[PDB]
Amino acid sequence: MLKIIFFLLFLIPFCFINNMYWMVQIMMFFISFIFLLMNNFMNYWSEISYFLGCDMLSYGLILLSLWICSLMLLASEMINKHNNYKNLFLLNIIILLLLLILTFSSMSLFMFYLFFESSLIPTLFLILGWGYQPERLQAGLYLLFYTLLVSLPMLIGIFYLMNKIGSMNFYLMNNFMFNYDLLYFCLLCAFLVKMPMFLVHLWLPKAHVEAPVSGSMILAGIMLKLGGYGMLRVISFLQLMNLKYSFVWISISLVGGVLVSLVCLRQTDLKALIAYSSVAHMGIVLSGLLTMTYWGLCGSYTLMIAHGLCSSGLFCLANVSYERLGSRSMLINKGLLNFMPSMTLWWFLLSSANMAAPPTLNLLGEIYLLNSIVSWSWISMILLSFLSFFSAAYTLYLYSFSQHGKLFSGVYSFSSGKIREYLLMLLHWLPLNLLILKSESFMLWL
Amino acid sequence: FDWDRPSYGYFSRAKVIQSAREAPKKEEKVSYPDATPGLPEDYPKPPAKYGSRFHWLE
């Protein structure tokens, strides 16, 4: 994997050299193409460089990270229009990219945690250096301190594990199992905030709402997934303690799911709908994951990947409106079918994927997760039905009201659809259809 | 008695004398067999094992 790492480092200079926004973009896609070629892994750790490995679980996560990290540059061009320090933007993105690769490939838990929490900074740059709302300040406070206030405490659990174990490679922990009843909460809850959990969803709507197209795409596209990837690696040894205290987590996730869907119905902001929607889906992922059954886990991996893709594309849609009609509101945005009908196609498709319409790697997830939960406890079905029902419900409302009603009277002439955005929407969705042909690499990792 | 008054300081000098009691206390050194040892300069130092033996060898 050092091949990728050195490639990114040698891409860093382009940020300094003037007028390299598009040259950087093609390179990031090109290396993604290279990283695609490198694919032979099994469940065992593979490509063991000095301390960097790669695996089913890490391989797809990295590909999504490289994928989304290149799509940033397609998404954001107003930075170039404004000349709003394009150099700092490009440097921030690449720095973030390297951290993600090193986070997902750190074969040590401590190396993993180190890059995991190192990512706190570059994301904060991305919101703050290019935010729009005055809330951008307090939002950054929410994001950083919700994370650090629990992300720091696992640092003790990591060192405690060292003392009782002698290392932090993932295979080594798996050999052992811990049941001290604080190790469990300290690690679990610390990941749950970044997951996030319904009770600590609070920050996430704020972070997305007052963040640029780019930052929001990052926030919903990796950060939530990165929390989950840690879970998949770490719960190997939390089993007994998890079994004793698991009903609480699955309950709040499932209960919170129907609630947050009803929040979506009543919500009146494009980013707020998607933000709450993304929390809902990651609620079900957290559920299947905490089931720990084979079906749950192998499906969780899939739903994280698919959810990240759909959430990004929906954010590009939200950016499109925000960049034409200059206001996030449901009320102002309406009837866009009359102004960008070929775009409303993509609005429908990305909405479709978020409500689990096939052929859709998202959908492939819920079959796996729903099978797991139902097996785990028949009682779940009474809320699983409503959870999916209201899932599709708000997505319908989002698609219709935004695109259907009669136009808005006060709307000042704005340019029409353009190749950058069109290609951006295809690129997020079409792979989301591609993968089903070869889900086995994205479906089997245990 | 025809004795002579000693010098101004005849008793001020040292008195080196013969031994009659013949009881010199014994000159001795203490022995703590279990004192705390360190690493002698002759103890072989094989070059390090497993780098710095730290998290990722570094």
UniProtKB/TrEMBL annotation, chain B:
Domain of life: Eukaryota
Annotated spans, Disordered: 22-50
Chain intervals with Basic and acidic residues compositional bias: 22-31
Compartments, record wording: Mitochondrion inner membrane
Protein task: Accessory subunit of the mitochondrial membrane respiratory chain NADH dehydrogenase (Complex I), that is believed not to be involved in catalysis. Complex I functions in the transfer of electrons from NADH to the respiratory chain. The immediate electron acceptor for the enzyme is believed to be ubiquinone.
Family named by the database record: Belongs to the complex I NDUFA8 subunit family.
The protein, known as: NADH dehydrogenase [ubiquinone] 1 alpha subcomplex subunit 8
Residues of the full protein shown: 118 to 175 of 175
